[PDB]
Amino acid sequence: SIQAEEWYFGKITRRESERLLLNAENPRGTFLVRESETTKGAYCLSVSDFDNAKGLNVKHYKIRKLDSGGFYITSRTQFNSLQQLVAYYSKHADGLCHRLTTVCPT
C-alpha cells in the first residue's frame, strides 16, 4: 500500500510540496510523492536540489502508472511498484536532479 508509505503525502498541492521542500535544512534529494493536481492517475515525485546557480530549489517529476501494472518516470525504465521505483531512484540519479535521499519533513 502506497498510502502506508511515509514518503507518500497523498493529496497535497504543488505549492505545499514546495513550501515543505524549500527548507534550508533539507539536503539534496529530500523528497515526497503526491497526487498530481493536473493528471488524473499520475503522481508527482517532488524533489529538493541545491546548486550554486539556483540555490535550493525543487523539481517535480511525473510518475505514470499503467493498467499493464508498471510505474515509471521514463517508459524505458519501469517498476512493478511505486516502492521499487523509489528504491531504484534512491540509488541512481539517472535523469533526476539528485538521487532520492530522505523523506521530506512536515
Ligand X SMILES: *C(=O)c1cc(C[C@H](NC(C)=O)C(=O)N[C@H]2CCCCN(Cc3ccc(-c4ccccc4)cc3)C2=O)ccc1OP(=O)(O)O
3 binds ligand X (CB under 6 A): no
**Closest CB to ligand X among 37 and 51?**
37
74 binds ligand X (CB under 6 A): yes
What stretch of H or E contains 51? strand 43-51
Pick the piece of the chain touching ligand X (CB under 6 A) from 24-32, 37-45, 80-88, 98-106: 37-45
Q: How far apart are CA 31 and CA 21, in angstroms?
A: 7
69 binds ligand X (CB under 6 A): no
Q: What is the grid cell recorded at 94?
A: 539517472
Q: How far apart are CA 78 and CA 70, in angstroms?
A: 6
42 binds ligand X (CB under 6 A): yes
Distance of CA 89 to the CA centre of its chain: 9
Catalog residues that contact ligand X under the rule CB under 6 A.
Answer: 14, 36-39, 42, 44, 59-62, 73-74, 94-96
